[PDB]
């Protein structure tokens, strides 16, 4: 288990390996956080979240 193969490259969501290095990205409605790892919802009711 290396890069994205290891705990999702520590990404909140989409993880892709580009040149023996990890790179995170988020689905529509989210923006990549400062740490280039987490995903911050852009507006209310972001996709994939239960309104609990």
């Amino acid at each position: 288990r290396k890069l994205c193969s290891l705990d999702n490259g520590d990404c909140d969501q989409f993880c892709h390996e580009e040149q023996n290095s990890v790179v995170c990205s988020c689905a529509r409605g989210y923006t990549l956080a400062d740490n280039g790892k987490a995903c911050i919802p852009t507006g209310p009711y972001p996709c994939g979240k239960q309104t609990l």
Binding site: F14, H16, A27, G29, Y45, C47, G48, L52
Partner: protein, 234 residues
């Protein structure tokens, strides 16, 4: 949904219900955006004219969060075939946008490659609908959700009397009496990842419901992602 639990207030906001002229739910749907719903291709033949209801968990007692929307455009995959149910996928464009709220929110669309090696490699996915609670039973008035494990691709085909194309994938149990059923078709199949739910399949078909040695068959959404974006774009 045979077995499972009912979707509690907020648990399944991306569920969508396709109703006919008699306001009877006949198929499921998945909210993709305020304008687009995802559903099974074969569901389009189940009724001549239908609308889409969202924000509903109890078909017989308004939770005040429901809302009907007229379908404006129906985009059926042209390669669909009632003979094998391959390419059982279609998108719906709504006349009016969806007003997201308590039980009305979209399910995310993943990226093919990530979805395939991470989402589909998880242990379980979630399926939900207003379908039958038993094979010979009747439609459910309470929205339901069932945790179905991913079924090995090999076993999958070995158990199917019918052909399992590359646009389908098995899920559910070998014997446990838990599985989706009639009425759930076109319904959502989502995989959870870090408290975020991703669309991963459309409820397609199956030999009976929960029948031993038989699994539930879902449309492989990761195989139509490029197609699903094109359809929404226009």
């Amino acid at each position: 949904i045979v077995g499972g639990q009912e979707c509690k207030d907020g648990e399944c906001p991306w569920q969508a219900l396709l109703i006919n002229e008699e306001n009877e739910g006949f198929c499921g749907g998945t909210i993709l955006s305020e304008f687009y719903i995802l559903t099974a291709a074969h569901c389009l033949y189940q009724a001549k004219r239908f609308k889409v209801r969202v924000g509903d968990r109890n078909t017989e007692q308004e939770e005040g969060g429901e809302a009907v929307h007229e379908v404006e455009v129906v985009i059926k995959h042209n390669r669909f075939t009632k003979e094998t149910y391959d390419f059982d996928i279609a998108v719906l464009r709504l006349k009016t946008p969806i007003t997201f709220r308590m039980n009305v929110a979209p399910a995310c669309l993943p990226e093919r490659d990530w979805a395939e090696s991470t989402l589909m490699t998880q242990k379980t996915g979630i399926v939900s609908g207003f379908g039958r609670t038993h094979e010979k039973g009747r439609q459910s008035t309470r929205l339901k959700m069932l945790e179905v494990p991913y079924v090995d691709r090999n076993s999958c085909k070995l158990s199917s009397s019918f052909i399992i194309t590359q646009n389908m994938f098995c899920a559910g149990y070998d014997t446990k009496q838990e599985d989706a059923c009639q009425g759930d078709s076109g319904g959502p199949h989502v995989t959870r990842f870090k408290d975020t739910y991703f669309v991963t399949g459309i409820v397609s078909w199956g030999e009976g419901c929960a029948r031993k040695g038989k699994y539930g068959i879902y449309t492989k959404v990761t195989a139509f992602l490029k197609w699903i974006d094109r359809s929404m774009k226009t």
